[PDB]
């Protein structure tokens, strides 16, 4: 148990900058009491400490000046927040508190993912680094805003999350209007003429005498960004309409939306130039593209300046989603017209199966197998249709938008809302040959509902069979790796490993380029063990393999110019109970070489352990 600590229910703090958190003053006052008592003595608000302490025993005797003495005690000082179970390093992070009314800890939204906190009533514990030294650790190495990339994968971790994406996606989208088809004419104003008498759409995919265009593009031609945005504000064009804007000498065809986004970045990073060459301007911003935007920002500008961009994206993302007007009505779970047919065609293919069985061409299992085989294919063809439908017809539909932006939901879930639940499995493991035809919109049958509850358990049970503890694995791992720390700078070993870029045994023993991730996971932030001259460029021995360096190698392997990469690994490192800095490579959480003295075994155990909790357990198919 621990002396300067507390616990409370957490609530989101959208107002907080990334390194701040909201602490109830009532709780701050206890945690810092001894410190507080001293300031009280340094100020004309208490003679001595005993009398100051007595001031604080009863709530009614607490004055005003006291709370001003707190805001001063707290100054600089940070605290730690912890949400159990601490599954990895980021289970504890340090913020500098901001005193709030009420009795809830206020948590920045960007740190929820790592804490795996959500606001259905999770509580965080708070801890207070007392000493000059512990405060420095907390501030330099534990502060939220200094831990933006994951130490397991080296990918950003404090990244746009939900409503934040949603917002930003909706503005960087562009509408696709269909009431203009692909007509052509003696363009000039004869184009807009059509548009005027309601004939063409404005974002219609016209292809006039010459080139392809909006309407649209030739109608609205802004000399600068803020002319474009003065326009949208005047309601004479939406951020989603595609338009013509002269930006940075270049004459562009985008939406005012996409410009505005581009501005947001530019201003957040104090650099109009670098901004414009980090951004993917010709696609809608989404979970992934933003992720990559952050990562780049992080490499190119500081980490300090990256946190500024992060809060910037947060801020707008949030506000843009509010006015966006996304919700969910029942009519948003859109059932594709195709479902009738796929099910009618399924049902008749099923007649044929049942016939060939009743004759005796089918063994009991052969029929059973064949039915499942069918309902599988069908569940797919339906899921396919659902999405195809959303893309062609209702591409700004909230369910679709949420799922695509990565803001929330997957195709399995969307299928269950609009298509059909499909096959459910028996308590015994096997599958019911009758699938659930209803979507959650249609609403299940009492039998359909029971049938499908069997898997419900298996779920709930196999979660709560690790969601109590699978930190069972991480225990096992720490126990074997805890002693390992980056001890030297270089152990000076000659040997190494050779990371392959090819998988055998596809067409039994045939070679095949490994997946980009699988390679990135093998190569990023490794030190090159021997020189590697590839694609007319020599990568030098002892070089830390940057992310771009990796894509290069992948590019070179696609051009059939390399097959393995010699790479210094901890597998072959010669440091005694530990690992040298060259053999480990990059930090990962910071995208530079690991610093000597990192507890790199513990970081390894957590990295492997943490995901274990979400590894669908016993063999079920």
């Amino acid at each position: 148990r621990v002396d300067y600590s507390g616990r409370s229910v957490i609530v989101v703090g959208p107002q907080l900058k990334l390194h701040q958190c909201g602490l109830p003053k009532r709780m701050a006052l206890e945690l810092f009491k001894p410190f507080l008592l001293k300031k009280m003595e340094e100020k004309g608000i208490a003679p001595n400490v005993k009398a100051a302490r007595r001031m604080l025993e009863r709530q009614r005797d607490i004055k005003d000046e006291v709370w001003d003495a707190l805001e001063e005690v707290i100054h600089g000082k940070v605290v730690l927040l912890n949400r159990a179970p601490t599954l990895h390093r980021l289970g504890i992070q340090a913020f500098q508190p901001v005193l709030v009314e009420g009795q809830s800890i206020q948590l920045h939204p960007l740190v929820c993912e790592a804490f795996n906190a959500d606001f259905d009533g999770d509580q965080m514990a708070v801890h207070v680094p007392l000493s000059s030294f512990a405060q420095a650790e907390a501030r330099i190495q534990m502060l939220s805003a200094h831990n933006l990339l994951s130490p397991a994968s080296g990918e950003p971790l404090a990244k746009p999350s939900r409503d934040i994406i949603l917002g930003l996606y909706y503005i960087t989208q562009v509408r696709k209007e269909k009431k203009g088809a692909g007509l052509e004419f003696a363009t000039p104003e004869e184009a807009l003429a059509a548009h005027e008498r309601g004939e063409v759409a404005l974002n219609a995919p016209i292809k006039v005498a010459g080139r392809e265009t909006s309407v649209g593009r030739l109608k609205y031609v802004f000399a600068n960004p803020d002319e474009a945005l003065l326009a949208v504000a005047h309601g004479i064009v939406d951020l989603q309409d595609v338009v013509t804007v002269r930006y940075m000498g270049k004459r562009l065809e985008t939406s005012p939306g996409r410009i505005l986004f581009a501005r947001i970045v530019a201003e957040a990073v104090e650099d109009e130039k670098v901004a414009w060459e980090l951004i993917q301007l010709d696609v809608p911003q989404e979970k992934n593209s933003l992720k990559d935007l952050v990562y780049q920002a992080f490499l190119r500008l500081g980490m300090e300046k990256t946190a500024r961009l992060l809060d910037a994206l947060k801020y707008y993302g949030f506000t843009f989603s509010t006015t966006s007007g996304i919700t969910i009505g029942i009519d948003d779970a859109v059932i594709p017209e195709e479902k009738k047919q796929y099910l009618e065609e399924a049902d008749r293919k099923l007649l044929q199966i049942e016939q060939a069985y009743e004759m005796g061409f089918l063994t009991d299992r052969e029929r059973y197998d064949q039915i499942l085989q069918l309902w599988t294919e069908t569940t797919e063809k339906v899921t396919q249709a659902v999405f195809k439908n959303f893309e062609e017809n209702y591409p700004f539909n909230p369910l679709y938008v949420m799922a695509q932006s990565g803001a929330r939901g997957n195709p399995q879930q969307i299928r269950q809302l609009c298509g059909l639940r499909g096959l459910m499995q028996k308590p015994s493991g096997e599958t019911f040959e009758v699938p659930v035809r209803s979507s959650f919109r249609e609403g299940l049958t009492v039998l359909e509902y029971f049938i499908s509850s069997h898997g419900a358990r298996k779920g709930g049970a196999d979660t709560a069979l690790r969601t109590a503890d699978s930190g069972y694995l991480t225990r096992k791992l720490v126990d074997v790796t805890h002693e390992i720390v980056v001890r030297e700078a270089d152990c000076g070993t000659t040997n190494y490993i050779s990371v392959p870029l090819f998988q055998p045994d596809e067409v039994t023993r045939s070679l095949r380029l490994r997946k980009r991730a699988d390679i990135e996971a093998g190569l990023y932030g490794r030190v090159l063990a021997r020189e590697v001259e590839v694609l007319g460029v020599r990568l030098e021995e002892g070089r830390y393999l940057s992310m771009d360096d990796v894509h290069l190698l992948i590019k070179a392997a696609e051009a059939g110019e390399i097959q393995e990469v010699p790479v210094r690994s901890p597998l072959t490192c010669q440091t005694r109970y530990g690992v040298c800095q060259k053999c480990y490579g990059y930090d990962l959480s910071m995208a530079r070489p690991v610093s000597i003295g990192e507890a790199v075994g513990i970081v390894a155990a957590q990295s492997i352990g943490e995901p274990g909790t979400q590894l669908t357990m016993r063999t079920f198919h």
Partner: protein, 95 residues
């Protein structure tokens, strides 16, 4: 973030050395009032309360400001272990 974290990092060979240097400079920056400070008047840390910007009491901070000016020196084996705890008490009273 902290004002100058990236460049503070750039000043050392191990992440952890920074923290050490900072802590230790904070310890002495407290031990001798704030008299040691290598920060000229106008560049001293500041607060706001009771309405009158007094010097920022947080020494964890102070040290980080001073580092960034480069008026400090840090090293593994500089001066002897006790020719320091008295020699620093000469220029600034231990009281």
């Amino acid at each position: 973030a902290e004002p100058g974290i990236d460049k503070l990092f750039g000043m050392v060979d191990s992440k952890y050395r920074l923290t050490v240097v900072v802590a230790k400079r904070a310890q002495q920056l407290l031990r001798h009032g704030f008299k040691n400070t290598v920060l000229e008047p106008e560049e001293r840390p500041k607060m706001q309360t009771l309405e009158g910007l007094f010097d920022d009491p947080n020494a964890e901070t102070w040290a980080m400001k001073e580092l960034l000016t480069g008026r400090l020196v840090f090293g593994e084996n500089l001066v002897p272990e006790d020719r320091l705890q008295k020699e620093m008490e000469r220029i600034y009273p231990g009281e």
